[PDB]
Amino acid sequence: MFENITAAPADPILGLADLFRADERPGKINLGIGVYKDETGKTPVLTSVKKAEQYLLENETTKNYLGIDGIPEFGRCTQELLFGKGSALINDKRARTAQTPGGTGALRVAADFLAKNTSVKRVWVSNPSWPNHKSVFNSAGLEVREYAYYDAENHTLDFDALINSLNEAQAGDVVLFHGCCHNPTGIDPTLEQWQTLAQLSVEKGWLPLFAFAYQGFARGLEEDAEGLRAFAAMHKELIVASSYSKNFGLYNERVGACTLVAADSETVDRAFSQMKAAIRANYSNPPAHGASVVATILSNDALRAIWEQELTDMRQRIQRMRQLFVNTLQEKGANRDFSFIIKQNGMFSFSGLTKEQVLRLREEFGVYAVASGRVNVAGMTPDNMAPLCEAIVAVL
Amino acid sequence: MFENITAAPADPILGLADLFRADERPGKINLGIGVYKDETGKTPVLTSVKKAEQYLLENETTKNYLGIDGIPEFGRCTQELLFGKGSALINDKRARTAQTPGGTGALRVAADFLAKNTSVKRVWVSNPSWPNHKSVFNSAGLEVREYAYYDAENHTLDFDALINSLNEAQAGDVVLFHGCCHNPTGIDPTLEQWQTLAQLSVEKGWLPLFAFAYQGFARGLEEDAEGLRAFAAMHKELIVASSYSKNFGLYNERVGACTLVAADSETVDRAFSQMKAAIRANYSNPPAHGASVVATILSNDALRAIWEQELTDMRQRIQRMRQLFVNTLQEKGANRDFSFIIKQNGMFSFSGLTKEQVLRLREEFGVYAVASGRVNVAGMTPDNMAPLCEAIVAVL
Ligand SMILES: Cc1c(O)c(CN)c(COP(=O)(O)O)c[n+]1C
Numbered sequence: 001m002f003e004n005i006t007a008a009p010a011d012p013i014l015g016l017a018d019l020f021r022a023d024e025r026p027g028k029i030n031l032g033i034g035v036y037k038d039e040t041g042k043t044p045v046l047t048s049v050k051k052a053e054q055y056l057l058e059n060e061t062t063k064n065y066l067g068i069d070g071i072p073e074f075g076r077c078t079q080e081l082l083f084g085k086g087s088a089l090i091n092d093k094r095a096r097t098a099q100t101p102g103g104t105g106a107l108r109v110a111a112d113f114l115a116k117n118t119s120v121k122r123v124w125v126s127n128p129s130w131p132n133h134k135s136v137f138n139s140a141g142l143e144v145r146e147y148a149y150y151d152a153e154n155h156t157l158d159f160d161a162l163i164n165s166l167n168e169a170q171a172g173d174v175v176l177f178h179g180c181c182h183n184p185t186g187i188d189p190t191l192e193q194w195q196t197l198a199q200l201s202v203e204k205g206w207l208p209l210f211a212f213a214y215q216g217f218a219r220g221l222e223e224d225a226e227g228l229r230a231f232a233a234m235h236k237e238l239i240v241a242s243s244y245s246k247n248f249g250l251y252n253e254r255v256g257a258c259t260l261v262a263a264d265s266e267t268v269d270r271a272f273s274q275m276k277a278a279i280r281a282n283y284s285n286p287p288a289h290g291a292s293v294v295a296t297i298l299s300n301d302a303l304r305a306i307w308e309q310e311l312t313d314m315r316q317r318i319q320r321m322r323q324l325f326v327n328t329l330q331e332k333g334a335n336r337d338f339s340f341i342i343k344q345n346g347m348f349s350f351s352g353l354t355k356e357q358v359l360r361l362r363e364e365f366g367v368y369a370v371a372s373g374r375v376n377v378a379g380m381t382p383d384n385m386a387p388l389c390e391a392i393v394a395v396l
Numbered sequence: 397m398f399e400n401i402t403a404a405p406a407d408p409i410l411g412l413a414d415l416f417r418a419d420e421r422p423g424k425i426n427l428g429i430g431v432y433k434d435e436t437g438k439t440p441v442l443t444s445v446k447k448a449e450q451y452l453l454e455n456e457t458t459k460n461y462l463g464i465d466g467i468p469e470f471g472r473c474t475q476e477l478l479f480g481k482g483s484a485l486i487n488d489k490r491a492r493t494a495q496t497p498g499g500t501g502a503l504r505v506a507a508d509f510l511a512k513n514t515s516v517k518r519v520w521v522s523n524p525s526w527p528n529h530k531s532v533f534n535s536a537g538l539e540v541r542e543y544a545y546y547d548a549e550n551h552t553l554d555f556d557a558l559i560n561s562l563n564e565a566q567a568g569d570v571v572l573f574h575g576c577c578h579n580p581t582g583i584d585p586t587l588e589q590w591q592t593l594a595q596l597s598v599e600k601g602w603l604p605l606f607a608f609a610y611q612g613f614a615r616g617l618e619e620d621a622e623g624l625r626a627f628a629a630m631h632k633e634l635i636v637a638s639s640y641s642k643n644f645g646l647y648n649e650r651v652g653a654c655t656l657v658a659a660d661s662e663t664v665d666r667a668f669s670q671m672k673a674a675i676r677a678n679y680s681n682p683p684a685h686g687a688s689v690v691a692t693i694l695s696n697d698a699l700r701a702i703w704e705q706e707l708t709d710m711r712q713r714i715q716r717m718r719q720l721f722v723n724t725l726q727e728k729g730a731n732r733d734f735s736f737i738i739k740q741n742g743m744f745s746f747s748g749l750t751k752e753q754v755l756r757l758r759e760e761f762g763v764y765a766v767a768s769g770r771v772n773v774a775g776m777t778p779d780n781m782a783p784l785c786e787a788i789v790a791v792l
């Protein structure tokens with residue numbers, strides 16, 4: 001049956017980790033990881049999630065199935081965080097949230113909900129996009145198209161090329177937005193361009209589907225959500241896919257949310273029950289632990305206080321590593337302005353290096369970067385900066 | 397977009413829980429729950445998983461993503477438990493395991509692996525089957541057919557009707573087997589009939605897909621696996637979908653496994669990488685907590701010792717509740733032999749009650765049973781037995 005000729009192929013960002021843990025070479029550096037690392041090169045458990053898991057250890061009395069949409073508190077915290085406490089959507093009950101196995105679990109659920117309950121045939125993902133959005137959408141049977149996004153020769157957002165490539169999208173087409181700055185690019189848009197894109201989806205009939213995996217890593221938790229909140233300010237309907245893997249350090253617990261907005265409460269509840277039947281046929285009901293830890297921290301000032309400082313330290317670290325990188329590049333002699341790496345947000349940026357320049361990095365210097373030129377700033381530490389920069393300088 | 401006429405419908409076993417928590421009525425009893433309950437009517441956390449989670453609390457230092465297939469230890473324990481320690485399959489490396497979000501997450505992954513990488517078009521599920529197998533398989537796009545299984549007027553397995561309905565299955569058809577006795581029926585087959593069905597799938601070309609969610613609840617952990625191990629004794633290929641929700645009391649952590657067997661190592665690894673690409677496009681990588689708790693208990697004699705006694709007490713409880721039920725039925729005067737409820741294994745049996753008789757139970761006596769006549773023996777306690785039996789007796 002699988003009796004031969006069952007095919008094979010590898011994940012573009014993950015497969016690199018294998019010939020990372022494979023090298024003897026001392027200075028060896030893994031960039032193009034997905035996760036945050038501290039100054040030690042460890043991805044530590046947050047103190048707040050350790051405190052939260054101790055609470056949970058003493059207080060859980062059962063391990064009985066969660067509802068198909070998960071933990072109630074979690075969903076409300078997820079909407080408080082994505083849309084605000086003073087918020088029409090939460091208020092008017094036009095948003096329903098399903099806790100999901102990670103932000104990627106939420107996109108498959110958006111995708112399957114969409115494929116069988118609507119007329120949506122295409123979904124539009126930026127070029128470039130996180131590689132896996134495409135597979136999520138194709139596995140639901142939706143076909144995936146690509147709108148322009150990244151400049152390249154200016155290292156910015158090509159706003160004109162974005163708009164002018166998206167016009168080709170017809171009305172019931174889904175367009176995927178990166179709310180909290182973009183993987184792999186690090187680029188935004190500005191609030192004005194978010195407003196401009198929110199406008200041009202209202203009059204042109206597109207359905208927004210936000211992917212929101214790095215809330216609290218660009219400017220700040222709430223500042224990051226202006227984009228989503230510009231679109232929700234004027235969309236009758238939208239889907240958000242959020243993850244708590246990054247900002248809570250809760251990666252292997254698979255914590256995420258799939259929020260649906262639908263015009264009014266009644267509609268959102270009829271649509272969200274088909275969202276719940278898509279989940280039920282998939283993984284049945286979500287994993288309690290990580291989400292139980294998220295609902296406890298956020299629903300406790302003591303613990304949310306420490307978490308936010310923990311998030312402010314993660315974010316602060318990456319910002320001085322984006323600054324120490326551009327700077328040790330200047331310092332070890334670079335022939336190019338890498339200062340675009342500043343106002344580029346989050347862990348990732350395309351460094352402008354070519355396929356050739358990347359392979360040359362891994363082979364010659366032990367600096368593993370995702371084959372596209374994307375590097376993870378959080379995998380950089382103040383003791384890394386000089387081996388790192390030296391290598392890049394050698395190559396250009 | 398969801399702007400109306402987006403449809404709706406409810407889950408046949410779950411929707412009952414809502415007008416369960418909705419009644420004032422004192423004696424109120426919820427049967428047709430899925431989970432185990434102790435003599436108190438609580439679904440307690442196992443001592444062993446509390447000890448295991450304390451270990452984990454002190455020893456985890458990171459919450460970094462698990463591989464797409466999960467925790468290595470977990471997968472080997474899952475194969476030690478499903479096929480044995482002295483086992484050709486594990487030995488010859490012809491079995492690969494993906495930790496999955498619950499046994500239902502494993503069936504969707506089997507289903508999606510099958511739909512896009514093979515010629516499988518139909519899958520055959522017993523009539524009756526756990527309601528949700530069908531939706532799992534239809535959402536993958538496979539069409540679902542039903543083979544005969546349950547007698548009704550003898551309250552047993554109709555073996556002739558099973559075999560003679562399955563002949564209609566062509567060679568690349570998948571047939572779903574319940575390894576560890578059957579949901580909703582409680583019926584088996586015998587080792588001889590397992591041997592007989594394993595035989596008749598070898599010469600007839602069917603692909604076995606086992607659903608294994610109640611290991612250690614029928615006879616014992618290992619005794620329960622004779623069926624799976626009769627089929628694996630002679631199948632080049634098979635898929636197992638197992639869950640640790642029941643036997644570990646780990647329901648909301650979503651712990652499961654999807655095992656693939658493929659003739660030889662090379663094949664199983666080419667097939668399992670397409671299994672991993674199906675997972676990657678679904679939920680990306682599985683939840684650590686519950687599986688981390690399963691790998692710790694099973695990979696520690698002290699803790700596995702206490703767990704097994706905990707499993708032997710769960711199983712022992714249900715066996716005396718199947719016996720106290722048939723007995724208080726005899727005692728409160730029953731007009732019918734309910735002794736078929738003995739050798740019927742697990743928590744569930746069809747009691748032989750009609751749709752009419754069930755609605756009459758909930759409305760008149762506050763005894764919620766799944767509309768099909770299926771009742772969960774573990775939701776019965778020694779203080780329940782008399783309200784319970786009285787009600788059923790009143791109705792027949
Ligand atoms: C846009 C997006 C990106 O870029 C990622 C990055 N790995 C993720 C990850 O999903 P998670 O479930 O948090 O691992 C999700 N989403 C929705």
Ligand SMILES: Cc1c(O)c(CN)c(COP(=O)(O)O)c[n+]1C
Pocket residue numbers: 284430497498499500501503526574579607608609637638639640641642652
């Ligand atoms: C056959 C089977 C049944 O009957 C059930 C019962 N709920 C499950 C449950 O999946 P889980 O993921 O353990 O909740 C799975 N499987 C595979």
